[PDB]
């Protein structure tokens, strides 16, 4: 059974490239081989690349064009649909500079003045019918006619891919193929549209420590990351070095989040990643677009060690937790 050349292979970090159609359409042997490859990727790197996913490239291109049209809106129109609370986790955001005030501790004043916020903006969409948390959609005029219908369609197709990736994980683990279905079928996911504005490379010298997206781990089960061809995404290697996650045409980068790491009793890795300058020399870095679809267990789900991820009970590292509660704690922490 032919395995593809790794998407990334540097400094001990090996991120496999996997043809997802072989899990969905292959005979039983090929299906299992592919599922095991997916699982092995999550167990080692915490990251995989998938090609030939059910989401069509022309639709993805349209979704990116539609996203670009949103971010071209004037600042006042974007702020009108602003991110409000961590428990909603929906709407427009752009990181601002912290201000010095009467209340600030003088030890922190030097840091605040020299701090460089991430050069990015985002717009987050949740499932439409979540009680108490409506999506703040912008008005549908001119270029934004079709915005909602496009993004809701994309949301549901990514929701479907989440279910299938978890099925691959289950098949790879040798547990019931549909084990995760009842934990993920609600689609309590977040569609994060990202725009990193064009920026002069000198900005990164004027502001040392400046990045496009600060280093972090994702919170949920998995993240489906669709990136354009600009580059800048980096994944931390097992030797502690950030390695370039090179863009590959018509792939989706998939990584496990902290909840899946915990759920798997740390058999699956949630790996630190960031976005920095693209690895090419140029005076001006053009705009970068990406879409992060954060997949989560159902907010009602109780998360405890998956069967087959431990032998003796003493090997369980974590107490059970409610999924929804965990996420809001992560979202609310910074504020």
Ligand X SMILES: Cc1c[nH]c(=O)[nH]c1=O
316 annotated as ligand-binding: no
Q: Which residue from 218, 254, 261, 270 is in contact with Ni ion, where contact means CB under 5 A?
A: 218
Quote the DSSP letter at residue 205.
H
189 binds, among ligand X, ligand AKG, Ni ion, none (CB under 5 to 8 A by kind): none
Bridge partners, residue 191, by sequence: 125, 293
Q: Which residue from 42, 64, 183, 294 is in contact with ligand X, where contact means CB under 6 A?
A: 294
CB of 263 to ligand X, least distance (A): 14
CB of 183 to Ni ion, least distance (A): 21
56: left (phi over 0), alpha (psi -120 to 50) or beta: beta
SS3 87: coil
User: Binding string, 106-145, against ligand X, x = CB under 6 A?
Assistant: ----------------------------------------
Bridge partners, residue 251, by sequence: 51
Contacts of 225 (CB under 8 A, 6+ apart): 233, 252, 253, 254, 255, 290, 291, 292, 293
Q: Which residue from 125, 166, 184, 190 is in contact with ligand X, where contact means CB under 6 A?
A: 190
227 binds, among ligand X, ligand AKG, Ni ion, none (CB under 5 to 8 A by kind): ligand AKG
CB of 122 to ligand AKG, least distance (A): 7
216 annotated as ligand-binding: yes
- C-alpha distance from residue 13 to each of 6, 58, 255 (Å): 10, 31, 13
Q: How far apart are the C-alpha atoms of 208 and 216, rounded to whole Å?
A: 19
Residue sitting closest to Ni ion (CB): 218
Q: How far apart are the C-alpha atoms of 49 and 38, rounded to whole Å?
A: 9
Q: Which lies closer to ligand AKG via its Cβ, residue 22 or residue 162?
A: 162
124 contacts Ni ion (rule: CB under 5 A)? no
196 annotated as ligand-binding: yes
Which of these, 305, 303, 232, lies nearest to 273 by C-alpha position? 232
194 contacts ligand AKG (rule: CB under 6 A)? yes
133 annotated as ligand-binding: no
Q: How many residues bind Ni ion (CB under 5 A)?
A: 1
CB of 134 to Ni ion, least distance (A): 25
Provide the H-helix boundaries in the chain. Answer: 21-25, 28-44, 57-71, 75-79, 106-114, 147-173, 181-184, 203-206, 258-263, 323-332
Residue numbers 210-269 binding ligand X by CB under 6 A: 216, 218-220, 257
Q: How many residues bind ligand AKG (CB under 6 A)?
A: 11
Look at strands 17-19 and 47-51 and give their pairing.
parallel
Contact by Cβ (8 Å): 301, 235: no
CB of 213 to ligand AKG, least distance (A): 5
Contact by Cβ (8 Å): 98, 105: no
Bridge partners, residue 284, by sequence: 200
Q: Which lies closer to ligand X via its Cβ, residue 35 or residue 119?
A: 119
Binding site: which residues?
A: 192, 196, 216, 218, 273, 288, 290
| Residues in touch with ligand AKG (CB under 6 A) | 192, 194, 213, 218, 225, 227, 233, 273, 275, 290, 292
Binding site for Ca(2+): which residues?
A: 216, 218, 273
| Residues in touch with ligand X (CB under 6 A) | 89, 190, 216, 218-220, 257, 294
């Amino acid at each position: 059974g032919s395995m593809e050349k790794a998407a990334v292979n540097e400094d001990g970090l090996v991120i496999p490239l996997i043809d997802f159609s072989k899990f969905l359409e292959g005979d039983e042997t090929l299906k299992l081989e592919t599922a095991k490859a997916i699982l092995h990727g999550f167990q080692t790197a915490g990251f995989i690349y998938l090609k030939n996913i059910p989401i069509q490239p022309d639709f993805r291109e349209h979704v990116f064009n539609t996203s670009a049209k949103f971010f071209k809106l004037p600042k006042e129109k974007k702020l009108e649909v602003g991110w409000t609370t961590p428990e909603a986790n929906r709407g427009y955001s752009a990181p601002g500079r912290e201000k010095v005030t009467q209340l600030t501790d003088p030890a922190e004043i030097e840091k605040i003045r020299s701090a460089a916020p991430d050069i990015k903006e985002s717009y987050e969409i949740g499932r439409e019918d979540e009680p108490g948390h409506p999506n703040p959609w912008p008005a549908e005029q001119d270029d934004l006619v079709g915005f909602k219908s496009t993004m809701n369609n994309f949301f549901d197709q990514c929701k479907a891919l989440h279910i299938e990736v978890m099925r691959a994980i289950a098949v790879g683990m040798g547990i019931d193929a549909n084990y995760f279905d009842s934990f993920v079928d609600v689609g309590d996911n977040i569609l994060r549209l990202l725009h990193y504005p064009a920026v002069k490379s000198e900005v990164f010298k004027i502001n040392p420590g400046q990045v496009r997206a600060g280093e972090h781990t994702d919170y949920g089960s998995i993240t489906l990351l669709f990136q354009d061809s600009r580059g800048g995404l980096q994944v931390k290697s097992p030797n502690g070095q950030f390695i370039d996650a090179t863009p590959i045409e018509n792939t989706v980068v998939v990584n496990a989040g902290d909840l899946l790491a915990r759920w798997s009793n740390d058999t699956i890795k949630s790996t630190v990643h960031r976005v920095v300058e693209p690895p090419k020399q140029e005076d001006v870095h053009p705009p970068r677009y990406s879409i992060a679809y954060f997949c989560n267990p159902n907010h009602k789900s109780y998360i405890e060690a998956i069967p087959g991820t431990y032998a003796a009970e003493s090997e369980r590292k974590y107490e059970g937790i409610n999924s929804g509660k965990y996420l809001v704690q992560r979202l609310a922490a910074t504020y």
